[PDB]
Amino acid sequence: LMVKVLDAVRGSPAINVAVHVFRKLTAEEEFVEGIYKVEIDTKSYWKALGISPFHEHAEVVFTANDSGPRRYTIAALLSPYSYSTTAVVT
Amino acid sequence: LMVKVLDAVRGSPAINVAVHVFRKLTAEEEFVEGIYKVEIDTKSYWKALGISPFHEHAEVVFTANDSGPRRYTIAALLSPYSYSTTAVVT
Amino acid sequence: LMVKVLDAVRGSPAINVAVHVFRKLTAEEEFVEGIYKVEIDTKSYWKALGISPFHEHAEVVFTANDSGPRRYTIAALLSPYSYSTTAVVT
Amino acid sequence: LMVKVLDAVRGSPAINVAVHVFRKLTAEEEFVEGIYKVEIDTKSYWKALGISPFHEHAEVVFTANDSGPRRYTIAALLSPYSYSTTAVVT
Amino acid sequence: LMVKVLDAVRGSPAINVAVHVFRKLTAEEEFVEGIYKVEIDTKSYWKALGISPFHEHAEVVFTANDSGPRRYTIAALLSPYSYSTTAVVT
Prior knowledge:
Five copies of one chain form a homopentamer.
Chain A: E1 2-5, E2 17-21, E3 31-35, E4 38-42, E5 56-66, E6 72-74, E7 81-82, E8 85-89
PDB class: protein fibril
Keywords: Transthyretin, Amyloidosis, attr, Kidney, protein fibril
Assembly: pentameric
């Protein structure tokens, strides 16, 4: 087994390399979850409350609101660049 | 078994390389979930509440609202570029 | 078994390479889920509530609303480019 | 087993290398979660409350609001660059 | 087993190298969680309250608000650069 990546270079590259090599309630086992992962504005209200929640005679009022002036500005995401010009002007 | 990627280079590339090589309630096993993953504005309200929730005589009022001025601006996502010009002007 | 990708280069390419090589309630096993995945504005209200939810005599009122001024602007998504011009003007 | 990455260089690259090599209520086992991970504005209200919460005769009022002027500005995220110009002007 | 990364260099690179090599209520075991991890503005209200919270006759009023003028400005995140110019002007 042999893996050769990017053996010879002559210049000014802009690279983003990832190599994985392998040989051989909520449960997880033997995994790889996040590589080069990007999250923006992620929400999660309830999760895995319990084995027996609100079992008998429960009065529940769940109310969720998401509003308001938000703003996101990104010029280059997971994007290598070379010999170029990247700008944000406001 | 042999894998050769991008052996020789002469210049200024802009690259995004990923290599995977293999030989051989909620449950997961032996997996790869997120590589180069991007998430924007992800919501999830209830998930995996429990084994016996609200089992007997439950009065529930679930209300969800999503409003409001939001804004997202992206100039290059997962897009390498070379010898170019990328700009955002407001 | 042999795999050759992009052996020789002379210039300034813009590339996005992925290589997978293999030899050999909710359940998952032996899989690859997300590579180069992009999600925007994903919602999910209820999921995998439980083994016996609301089993007897349940009064439920589920109400969901999604409104509001939202905006998304993207100039290049999963699109490498070279010797070019990419811009967003507002 | 042999892995060769970026053996020879002559210039001024901008690189982002990751190499993984392997040989062989909420539970986790034998995993790799976050490499090069980026999170912005992540929220989570309730999680893993307990084995038997609100078991009998519970009156609950859950209210969640998210508003307000927020702002995020990023010029290059997970994007190596070379021989270029990156700027943010306000 | 052999791993060779970046054997020879002649110039002024800007690199970000990570190498992992392996041979062989809430619970965790035998894992690697955060490498090169970045978090900005992360919130979490309740988590792992207890084995039997609010077991009998509980009156609960949960209210959460997030507002206010916040601002974040970043010029280069996880992005090595060389022979270039990175600036933020306000």
